[PDB]
Design a protein around this ligand. Structure first.
Ligand SMILES: *[C@H](O)[C@H](C[C@@H]1CCNC1=O)NC(=O)[C@H](CC(C)C)NC(=O)OC[C@H]1CCC(=O)N1CC1CCCCC1
Ligand SMILES: *[C@H](O)[C@H](C[C@@H]1CCNC1=O)NC(=O)[C@H](CC(C)C)NC(=O)OC[C@H]1CCC(=O)N1CC1CCCCC1
Lengths: 306, 306
């Protein structure tokens, strides 16, 4: 029996229309063109033989507006003349002479661990694929990014407003990925330097495991539901010792509890038992806990509720 | 021998000139006036007997520009005319007809666990006090805020640029505090409604304990240093088991190791031992590990290095 759950991304058209290629000499990557501003990773400034320890302050001073070439390749092509350049954290803010006529309604936001967002993977300013990821508790994402993908963007949507939350910077030693928020800070403790970096321990996202167990109930799979309960407080002390995030309830989870008539605390008890082993059984075709679907995913994809 | 370490805030004058009072109906709090924009917590729109379950979308639609009264009390007082209103996350963006003539050079940034920032505590639009805090690993701060303090702001500085990072929203049941970033997201998992909420477990900030042990060494107090070393990888597995954050080195920590000739790994080993007890001894007048001073604090206050 199929759960009805897929990895669903937002439609990407509105964001495709904002993607550009930024070139600074022998260096190129992707940028995001909104209003009169183009955002891109600041290591587009750095020579290859310096990425291990750049002085980004000195590299920025060395640039002029004419040092940057910004091109839109898809749709109606454009070459954008840079009329101002600034640094904000790990991002460049380039001011251009033309406001993007396709600028959508948008905000900038930071995403929190366990939350899902959509990614538009781009190369040389050309969108090539889209996928969705959950921000991990260690501030990485399990993405799909190759050389030349930096500047690819991640976003959520609230109605027709796009909330840009991520712009891609790097791949870590374990194959996961991280990037900047549009305030210029990097997610987690990472620096945009070509050095090996200390990576932090990941955890199960407990609110997402709960959502996935609700999705199983909504598909008639409820062998793991018992009358026994574990309080949120007691689950959260248990979580600290067992590689789980602490559970924080939300209205989205509450809707799942009302729809199914199964209490959150029943599923917190179930998680504690299932973590010690599924004992030959499966849940939604899996023999281990799934934390990559959010309460919002389950409400929208199965119940049609946004 | 006094180490020379105090809780040191930035001079507050530039931020004082940006503070206003914002009143909506019978509700009042503080706002931050930059260029033609005034930022304030959106719960200023909520009547007191509705704070437990506000409908902020409907509240915003019900308001007009005339619903908001913004006043500058400091210096040359002014009543500002609101000419637009909008919501971003947990903040209101009010547009006013006068640009703040004292707007500093500024950015918006998010602060990470363990980093220090300065807070200007305000009441009725009037600055009252300034103090510094470190963001806790559970995204609360140990502040000093009373009724009427919402909209007080926190910030860091780089040169002459003020990086606004915090707008005060709420006090938790354990007496700690939290607030928004200026993208409108709350630090932590917290909602701006008057409902009691799951606050997550706090941890010792490993990088700041290391900074503090270096301050002790710079002060001549080095009885805890041994040849023994614990690697970062091995320290970090121990930290997960003992309610410490994972250690990630920075150039600021590296400068303390060069100056003292004591390796980071020597202090990681020391922390593991000291955490089991100081054996009746003291470090810098304490019998417990101190994590409220950053590597930058020690570099600046003790070695005189920005
Ligand atoms: C930008 O397009 C690019 C995207 C990367 C390329 C591979 N997949 C991606 O997601 N980003 C980079 O190349 C960064 C530049 C820095 C200046 C931020 N670096 C980067 O991702 O690196 C490569 C990864 C591979 C695994 C790893 O540990 N590592 C860094 C090491 C490589 C070996 C030398 C030490 C640093
Ligand atoms: C704004 O000026 C005000 C600042 C508070 C008052 C007391 N000390 C402060 O720092 N903010 C509030 O009063 C918030 C408004 C909500 C709409 C967010 N609520 C608030 O602080 O409350 C009172 C506190 C006191 C201890 C406690 O448990 N509690 C209730 C909170 C706990 C955290 C979640 C919201 C409800």
């Amino acid at each position: 029996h199929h759960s009805g759950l897929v990895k669903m991304s937002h439609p990407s058209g509105d964001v495709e229309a904002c993607m550009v290629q930024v070139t600074c000499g022998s260096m190129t990557l992707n940028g995001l063109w909104l209003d009169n501003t183009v955002w891109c990773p600041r290591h587009v400034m750095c020579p290859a033989d310096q990425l291990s320890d750049p002085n980004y302050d000195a590299l920025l001073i060395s640039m002029t507006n004419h040092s940057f070439s910004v091109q839109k390749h898809i749709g109606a092509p454009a070459n954008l003349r840079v009329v101002g350049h600034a640094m904000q954290g790990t991002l460049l803010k380039l001011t251009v002479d033309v406001a993007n006529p396709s600028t959508p309604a948008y905000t900038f936001t930071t995403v929190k661990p366990g939350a899902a967002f959509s990614v538009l993977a781009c190369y040389n300013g050309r969108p090539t694929g889209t996928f969705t990821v959950v921000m991990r508790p260690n501030y990485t994402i399990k993405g799909s990014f190759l050389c030349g993908s930096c500047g690819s963007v991640g976003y959520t949507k609230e109605g027709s407003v796009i909330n840009f939350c991520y712009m891609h910077q790097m791949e870590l030693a374990n194959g996961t990925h991280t990037g900047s928020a549009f305030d210029g800070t990097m997610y987690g403790a990472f620096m945009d330097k070509q050095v090996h970096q200390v990576q932090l321990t990941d955890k199960y996202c407990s609110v997402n495991v709960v959502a996935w167990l609700y999705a199983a109930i909504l598909n008639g799979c409820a062998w793991f539901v018992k009358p026994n309960r574990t309080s949120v407080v007691s689950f959260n002390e248990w979580a600290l010792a067992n590689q789980f995030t602490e559970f924080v309830g939300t209205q989205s989870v509450d809707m799942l509890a009302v729809k199914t008539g199964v209490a959150i605390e029943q599923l917190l008890y179930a998680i504690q038992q299932l973590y010690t082993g599924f004992q030959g059984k499966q849940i939604l075709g899996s023999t281990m806990l799934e934390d990559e679907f959010t309460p919002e995913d389950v409400n929208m994809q199965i119940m049609g509720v946004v």
